[PDB]
Amino acid sequence: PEELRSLLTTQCGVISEHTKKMCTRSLRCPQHTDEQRRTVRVYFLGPSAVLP
Ligand SMILES: [Zn+2]
């Protein structure tokens, strides 16, 4: 969780339909938006883990 939380800072992390898991490329990777990465943080680290 520590490094995962640190992952989402530069790494996409956007979970591809749960099964494929977090996206491993950078945030900017595809059309995976800020919301898309947000969705993951709030999922993994907490409902109130909306980091910028
Ligand atoms: Zn991505």
Swiss-Prot record:
Where is this protein localized, as stated in its record? Answer: Nucleus
- What are the SCA7 domain coordinates in residue numbering? 1-52
Concerning its family, UniProt says: Belongs to the SGF11 family.
Biological function: Component of the transcription regulatory histone acetylation (HAT) complex SAGA, a multiprotein complex that activates transcription by remodeling chromatin and mediating histone acetylation and deubiquitination. Within the SAGA complex, participates in a subcomplex that specifically deubiquitinates both histones H2A and H2B. The SAGA complex is recruited to specific gene promoters by activators such as MYC, where it is required for transcription. Required for nuclear receptor-mediated transactivation. Within the complex, it is required to recruit USP22 and ENY2 into the SAGA complex.
Oligomeric state and interaction partners are given as: Component of some SAGA transcription coactivator-HAT complexes, at least composed of ATXN7, ATXN7L3, ENY2, GCN5L2, SUPT3H, TAF10, TRRAP and USP22. Within the SAGA complex, ENY2, ATXN7, ATXN7L3, and USP22 form an additional subcomplex of SAGA called the DUB module (deubiquitination module). Interacts directly with ENY2 and USP22.
- Record note on domains: The long N-terminal helix forms part of the 'assembly lobe' of the SAGA deubiquitination module. The C-terminal SGF11-type zinc-finger domain together with the C-terminal catalytic domain of USP22 forms the 'catalytic lobe' of the SAGA deubiquitination module.
| The name this protein goes by in its record | Ataxin-7-like protein 3
